[PDB]
Amino acid sequence: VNMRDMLKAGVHFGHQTRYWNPKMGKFIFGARNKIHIINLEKTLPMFNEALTFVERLAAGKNKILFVGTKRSAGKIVREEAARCGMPYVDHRWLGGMLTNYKTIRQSIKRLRDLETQSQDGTFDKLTKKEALMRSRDLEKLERSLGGIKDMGGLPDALFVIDVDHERIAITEANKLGIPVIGVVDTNSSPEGVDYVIPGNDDAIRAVQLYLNSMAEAVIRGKQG
RNA sequence: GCUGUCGUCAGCUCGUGUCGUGAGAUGUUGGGUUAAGUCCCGUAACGAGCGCAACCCUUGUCCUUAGUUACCAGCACCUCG
Ligand SMILES: [Mg+2]
Ligand SMILES: [Mg+2]
Ligand SMILES: [Mg+2]
Ligand SMILES: [Mg+2]
Ligand SMILES: [Mg+2]
Ligand SMILES: [Mg+2]
Ligand SMILES: [Mg+2]
Ligand SMILES: [Mg+2]
Ligand SMILES: [Mg+2]
């Protein structure tokens, strides 16, 4: 937005220059002190195009799955999940979540049953050597499946934050043929994603900006 | 049909998903721990079954129920059982 806040937060930065993908060469403005610099001129049109796509997809009661699992990055995804709804994941991505989704329906049902059982006035009124085990199993299931408790169907567009770190999700999203919105850094590969956002990673301010922009865009799209 | 043995050793597999042209692989590998594929943490795997364990019999402590053919603390007698 207006080239200033992005410059301030973290965007014009990359993953050194020893580690990089040649397919990113068209986005690099240059190198500064053995560190690559992202051309912020090219990223703004792509960012705005992603904004319009999310806004127009929101109008129609669809779902955007947010993938942000990373240190200090999945958390902000989780608190961004409140407001504008939409499913999310912030812990490890289970293998075959979008291709073996029929099986994971069963685990979601089990999570729902456990949540009903524990929070119906503490029905776990049995031996104390088993209530703790049941509660910790419930917490373990929650810690992975809580974000996607909703969305009985497949999402119509998957928003990822790091192509390389979460390549499994992008691969199976491509296999299912559903759009992918990704924030590609210098060391990652743009291949496999539809809309590319050549921005920085590993920056709390940057990811905060991206998630808040997504939230406001989807809110505007949802307002109709 | 019934039985021995490896061996009461902790192992043997399947559904869906993914990798390979294929036989196949992953799950079931890795760090710890346990009598145990026992458990935890991690992880293209998510789950489940047969096994392990518990549920059964006996032994050790105590409570309640009842005292005959069993028992004898208190009392009378005893021919002194
Ligand atoms: Mg097998
Ligand atoms: Mg199998
Ligand atoms: Mg298989
Ligand atoms: Mg094949
Ligand atoms: Mg084996
Ligand atoms: Mg095997
Ligand atoms: Mg091991
Ligand atoms: Mg077992
Ligand atoms: Mg047994």
Curated annotation (Swiss-Prot):
PANTHER family: 30S RIBOSOMAL PROTEIN S2 PROKARYOTIC AND ORGANELLAR (PTHR12534), SMALL RIBOSOMAL SUBUNIT PROTEIN US2M (PTHR12534:SF0)
Record gene name: rpsB
Pfam families: Ribosomal_S2
GO BP annotations, alphabetical order: translation
Organism, scientific name: Pseudomonas aeruginosa (strain ATCC 15692 / DSM 22644 / CIP 104116 / JCM 14847 / LMG 12228 / 1C / PRS 101 / PAO1)
Family: Belongs to the universal ribosomal protein uS2 family.
GO cellular component: cytosolic small ribosomal subunit
MF GO annotations: structural constituent of ribosome
Coiled-coil parts of chain: none
HAMAP family in alphabetical order: Ribosomal_uS2_B
Protein's UniProt name: Small ribosomal subunit protein uS2
